[PDB]
Design a protein around this nucleic acid. Structure first.
Ligand SMILES: [Zn+2]
Length: 461
RNA sequence: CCAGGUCUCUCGUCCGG
């Protein structure tokens, strides 16, 4: 990522755009029942909690471009990854405007609850206005595509979401790029059969977890991994992706049959964003509010890792690589042990900031007792050891419960957190129900019992 | 009165076969 210029958008004929300026998070019934260190993220420049300049902070992530050329380790990685995907027999055809708009097997419909973005947003126009799920009417969309085309600017927003104390003071509020309806539709027409293939095949062939259900997948994962685990964190993954990675991606796409629409990837790489009263231009990087980001980022991870293993270990057989990524998040295995500090080493040379997994001070052996994926741990059931619980820690569930975006949701919300928390075990789950019930509104809530949740789990297998 | 992206999973409401 790398800004290439800002400037009042007035002098370039673009609309001013009024971001909402107030959080929607409000303390919960359970704010004082449970402890927690997190709070709403900074939404504006004029925020009392700020120990630093906002805009400087939120635009700090665009760090520059280490490389641009696809060297020969990347090339082999590309070759190896593309060959795996080839075994999925992915339909390489354009998706029709109807499926792209309304969904097919393996691809949901466009979210009607969200913005349609530029320019529809400066026209007071909405997705619901354009799209009809019932009739599956395409006439209106096609006219808007014909009229406004593709490759439109994005609209920058700051995400309203809980954030820790130090990220509040540091103004590390995260940013959002409202992709345009036109571009979502074009991206799904081109890539829809790709996204569908990935959603239908979470596992070690796609090397992606998109489409999985942790409650069930977790029992599948250890059997898919090779003997020895390794993993690490990135710092600013999207921001740190240099053009070379996007070329390598394009190469994978040519290799599995999407040659004709890799130009869509370039378009993603040069993008104009309108934030508030100005307008910038990033070169490199992929906006996160774009279609397929989630899948493309998982794809890049698979290349990034392959690249580093080939560079670091002479004669490593990639055929014994087993990894599953969900964007930057990854869990990886190999029949003999690999040193992620050494992997993090070579990653320095590609713009990649790789730190011990799980905020640890040091790189340490990754074990089935310490590895985490999608924020959850792995723990065999006590009675059926082949069945593995995805264990999210109560700390996180505690953070969530102390807040709400509408108290009308308390029952749905809390009940959802129970489906996460019982994996921590009967003694810890019951404690949870204690506290929730320690206040009156809690005792209004119908909450499942450990045994109900447990039977449901065993049955779901 | 609204206003804030892409996705996945699940749950709930409701409604169908
Ligand atoms: Zn530009």
């Amino acid at each position: 990522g790398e800004i290439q210029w800002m400037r009042p958008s007035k002098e370039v004929g673009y609309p001013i755009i009024n971001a909402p300026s107030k959080t929607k998070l409000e303390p919960s019934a359970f704010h004082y029942v449970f402890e927690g260190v997190k709070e709403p993220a900074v939404l504006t420049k004029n925020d009392p909690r700020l120990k630093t300049d906002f805009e400087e902070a939120i635009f700090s992530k665009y760090v520059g471009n280490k490389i641009t050329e696809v060297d020969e380790y990347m090339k082999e990685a590309v070759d190896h990854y593309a060959g795996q995907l080839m075994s999925l027999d992915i339909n390489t055809e354009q998706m029709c405007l109807e499926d792209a708009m309304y969904g097919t097997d393996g691809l949901e419909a466009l979210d009607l609850s969200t913005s349609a973005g530029y320019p529809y947003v400066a026209m007071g126009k909405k997705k619901r206005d354009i799209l009809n799920k019932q009739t599956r009417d395409t006439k209106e969309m096609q006219k808007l595509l014909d009229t406004y085309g593709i490759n439109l600017p994005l609209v920058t927003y700051v995400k309203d979401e809980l954030r820790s104390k130090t990220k509040v003071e540091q103004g590390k509020s995260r940013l959002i790029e409202a992709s345009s309806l036109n571009d979502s539709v074009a991206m799904r027409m081109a890539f829809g059969n790709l996204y569908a293939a990935f959603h239908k095949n979470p596992g070690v062939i796609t090397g992606s977890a998109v489409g999985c259900d942790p409650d069930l997948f977790w029992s599948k994962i250890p059997v898919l991994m090779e003997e020895k685990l390794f993993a690490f964190d990135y710092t600013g993954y999207d921001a740190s992706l240099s053009p070379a990675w996007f070329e390598a991606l394009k190469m994978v796409l040519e290799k599995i049959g999407f040659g004709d629409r890799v130009d869509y990837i370039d378009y993603l790489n040069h993008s104009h964003h309108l934030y508030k009263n100005k307008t910038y231009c990033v070169k490199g990087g992929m906006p996160s509010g774009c279609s397929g980001t989630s899948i493309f980022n998982s794809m890049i991870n698979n290349l990034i890792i392959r690249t580093l293993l080939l560079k670091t270990y002479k004669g490593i057989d990639l055929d014994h690589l087993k990894m599953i990524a969900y964007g930057d998040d990854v869990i990886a295995s190999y029949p003999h042990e690999v040193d992620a500090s050494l992997l993090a080493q070579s990653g320095k040379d590609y713009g990649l900031t790789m730190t011990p997994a799980d905020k640890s001070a040091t790189f340490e052996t990754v074990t089935w007792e310490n590895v985490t994926f999608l924020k959850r741990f792995f723990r065999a059931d006590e009675k059926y050891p082949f069945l593995i619980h995805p264990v999210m820690p109560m700390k996180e569930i505690h953070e969530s419960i102390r807040w709400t975006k509408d108290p009308r949701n308390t029952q749905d919300h809390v009940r959802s957190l129970c489906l996460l928390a019982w994996h921590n075990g009967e003694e810890e789950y019951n404690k949870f129900l204690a506290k929730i019930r320690s206040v009156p509104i809690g005792r209004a809530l119908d909450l499942p019992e450990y045994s109900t949740l447990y039977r449901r789990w065993l049955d779901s297998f």
